[PDB]
């Protein structure tokens, strides 16, 4: 028959902002930051990512553009 | 017929020790058809071929694809020793051990293929 103290008084949260489930764990945040910065890297340069598959050569699967010179002009 | 033959003084056993290391690291393909498919898919870094094979034309057909794709190849003189080094419980006549972007086996791979390129 006692008045339990509840969680809001038990830890003085106050008015701290709402943060993310990713932000509560510093490893999982640095896992998801690396997965999206390795993803941003494929949109700039070209990664190797395996050669021809087991099926063989199915064509250059995403376009061939003829008027594009992508060599470092020495 | 096997002109890049490995000689005795601690090169055959360096080859078979690197073979056993890659077989523990699961980076190794065993047998003639798997070596052929790995070279044709281009993932191969080096290929060991037995020279004690009953008729040698199998480990003679593999060097053509290896020379076309320009990967190093070398003959060790015992298929029983090659199977024992892989851990097969059968005699293996062709072994191709592949490439991965992050390992410590690749230092042994690089020194071994430098010695093989000096052998050729």
């Amino acid at each position: 028959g006692k008045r339990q103290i509840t969680w809001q008084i038990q830890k003085n949260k106050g008015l701290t902002p709402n943060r993310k489930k990713e932000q509560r764990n510093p490893r999982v945040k640095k896992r998801k930051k690396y997965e999206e910065k390795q993803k941003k890297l494929r949109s700039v340069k070209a990664v190797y990512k395996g050669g021809e598959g087991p099926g063989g050569y199915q064509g250059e699967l995403s376009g061939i553009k003829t008027n594009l010179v992508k060599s470092v002009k020495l | 017929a096997a002109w890049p033959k490995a000689e005795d003084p601690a090169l055959v056993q360096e080859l078979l020790d690197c073979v056993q290391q890659a077989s523990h690291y699961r980076q190794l393909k065993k047998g003639a058809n798997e070596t052929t498919k790995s070279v044709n898919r281009g993932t191969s870094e080096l290929v060991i071929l037995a020279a004690d094979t009953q008729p040698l034309s199998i480990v003679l057909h593999i060097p053509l694809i290896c020379e076309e794709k320009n990967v190093p190849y070398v003959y060790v003189p015992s298929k029983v020793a090659l199977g024992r080094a892989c851990g097969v419980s059968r005699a293996v006549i062709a072994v191709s051990l592949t490439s991965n972007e992050a390992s410590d086996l690749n230092s042994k791979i690089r020194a071994l293929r430098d010695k093989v390129e000096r052998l050729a």
């Binding site: - | 017929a1 096997a2 033959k5 000689e7 005795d8 003084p9 601690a10 055959v12 056993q13 078979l16 020790d17 056993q20 020279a51 004690d52 009953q54 008729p55 040698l56 034309s57 003189p77 015992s78 029983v80 020793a81 199977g83 024992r84 080094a85 851990g87 097969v88 419980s89 059968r90 005699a91």
Partner: protein, 378 residues
């Protein structure tokens, strides 16, 4: 543990042999309970047998036990699921232990041959197995690069021992609480101080004929402790090396202990209408497949697939190995095992088959799946 020297007190040229065989795939190992014998065959049989006395030259089989792979799912079945690989018998004559590639090592009563304990502590396979002499302490070295010592009086596992770099192929023990175990491709014999849990590493690195035929030490297959202070190791490039515990090097290594192999025929090596001997690879040495000793004696029994079983001895300063000759002066096949027994004058059984113990690497159409029992009476 008294030292003996019986290398000259035996007449090896006058050895009497029974080269018999029976319905089996390939017999692998034997233990010597002093009246009995215990064979393991790759069909999945462990056969307890009775040997012979002179005052009829084939053993009479008394019992066997077969691996039952149908009851792998079925519990409370001590016993093997697959074929056993090694067997050892306690010198009491009341325990016989056998380990196989079914990831478990079983041990039971020698008489009725009914399985009483099936230890499942190893993680890959059981390759080597050895008893302490005069005690029921067991040393089983495995294929997951570990060696577990068991206290078999209470049927209990007591301790494990790590440290081997590759898979462990053989282990030997003597009257004290020590071991010597050889692992395969790391070229290492480790001497094991079991109570204090420590080891001593011995790294081989072994070094008118063709020069490319001289092969270095590839593996280190077999081991044999000859007394407390030194042992001997046999390696598959045909090297037989005497090692002392006081020294970090080999004490005396002898090379190609069973000679080179024959070069393979042109009629199989090349498929041509002209066979030309201009190209043929250099033959490799036939390495030691089995190696044994009598404890505290001068006897080094080494068997390869040459068809003969060789016997070596120690020097008078016991710091060298010396040849005494071929013993069968054939026992064809691949010599899987050697077991020694003294009548009071020694009977040695040699276990040979068509292939090696652990894998079907070299199958031989020559040779027979035979236990070959020969004795030297002097």
């Amino acid at each position: 543990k008294v030292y003996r020297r019986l290398a000259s007190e035996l007449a090896f040229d006058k050895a009497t042999y029974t080269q018999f065989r029976w319905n089996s795939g390939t017999v692998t190992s034997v233990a010597v309970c002093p009246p009995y014998a215990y064979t393991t065959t790759k069909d999945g049989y462990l056969t307890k047998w009775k040997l012979q006395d002179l005052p009829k030259k084939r053993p009479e089989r008394i019992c066997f036990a077969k691996a039952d792979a149908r009851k792998a799912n079925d519990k409370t079945y001590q016993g093997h699921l697959k074929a056993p690989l090694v067997v050892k018998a306690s010198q009491d004559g009341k325990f016989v232990v056998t380990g196989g590639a079914d990831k478990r090592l079983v041990v039971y009563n020698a008489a009725d041959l009914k399985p009483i304990k099936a230890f499942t502590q190893h993680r890959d396979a059981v390759t080597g197995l050895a008893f302490r002499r005069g005690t029921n302490q067991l040393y089983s070295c495995s294929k997951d690069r570990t060696v577990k010592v068991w206290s078999l009086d209470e049927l209990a596992y007591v301790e494990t021992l790590f440290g081997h770099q590759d898979e462990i192929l053989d282990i030997d023990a003597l009257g004290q609480e020590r071991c010597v175990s050889v692992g395969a491709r790391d070229r290492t014999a480790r001497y094991w101080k079991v109570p204090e849990e420590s080891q001593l590493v011995f790294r081989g690195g072994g070094e008118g004929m063709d020069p490319a035929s001289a092969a270095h030490e590839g593996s280190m297959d077999r081991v044999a402790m000859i007394d407390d202070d030194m042992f001997v190791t046999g390696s598959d490039n045909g090297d037989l090396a005497l090692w002392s515990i006081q020294r970090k090097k080999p004490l005396h290594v002898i090379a190609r202990a069973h000679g080179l192999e024959p070069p393979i025929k042109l009629e199989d090596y090349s498929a041509d209408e002209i066979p030309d001997p201009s190209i043929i690879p250099a033959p490799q040495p036939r390495g030691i497949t089995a190696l044994r000793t009598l404890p505290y004696s001068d006897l080094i029994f080494s068997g390869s697939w040459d068809g003969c079983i060789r016997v070596w001895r120690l020097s008078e300063d016991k710091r060298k190995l010396e040849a005494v000759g071929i013993l069968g002066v054939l026992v064809r096949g691949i010599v899987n095992d050697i077991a020694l027994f003294e009548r009071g004058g020694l009977c040695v059984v040699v276990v040979t088959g068509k292939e090696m113990r652990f894998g079907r690497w070299k199958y031989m159409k020559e040779g027979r799946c035979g236990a070959v029992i020969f004795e030297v009476p002097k």
